[PDB]
Design a protein around this ligand. Structure first.
Ligand SMILES: Cc1ccc(S(=O)(=O)NC(=O)N[C@@H]2C[C@H]3C[C@@H]2[C@@H]2CCC[C@H]32)cc1
Length: 134
């Protein structure tokens, strides 16, 4: 057993707050915000050795990233940003930092009760999204 066991599995979005405002702060345009905000993704998290894979499946986009903790990678986000990402585990929280164009946003994922809580932060704006097991 290991590092991310309590994250592994298939998760479905159950609630969202402030996500449109977070996307505005990131610079996402109107049409993408509307369709991405309407998405109800399933997030599939798996681990094979040191490699973690996070898939997000929705009617808007299907994305997949694989990474090793602490080891930067290039990512194309669902909103079509080309970012440099680093994901670490900090006190049991997965911390995903994306850098692009001199900007930075952080996505934190943590287990709380039977939920996986996703917090997206861009400057002063936070969005909180709650997933439950599928
Ligand atoms: C389509 C969709 C998939 C997942 C979420 S999420 O907010 O639940 N998880 C993320 O991983 N968020 C990231 C914060 C930026 C990047 C990614 C998300 C894609 C659109 C812009 C946000 C929200 C929408």
């Amino acid at each position: 057993s290991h590092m991310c066991d309590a994250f592994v599995g298939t998760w479905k979005l159950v609630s969202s707050e402030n996500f449109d405002d977070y996307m505005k702060e990131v610079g996402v345009g109107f049409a993408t915000r509307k369709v991405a905000g309407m998405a109800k993704p399933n997030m599939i998290i798996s681990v094979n050795g040191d490699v973690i894979t996070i898939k997000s499946e929705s009617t808007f986009k299907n994305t997949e990233i694989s990474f090793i903790l602490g080891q930067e990678f290039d990512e194309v986000t669902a909103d079509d940003r080309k970012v440099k990402s680093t994901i670490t585990l900090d006190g049991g929280v997965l911390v995903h930092v994306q850098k692009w164009d001199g900007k930075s946003t952080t996505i934190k994922r943590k287990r709380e009760d039977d939920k996986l809580v996703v917090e997206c932060v861009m400057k002063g704006v936070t969005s909180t999204r709650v997933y439950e097991r599928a």
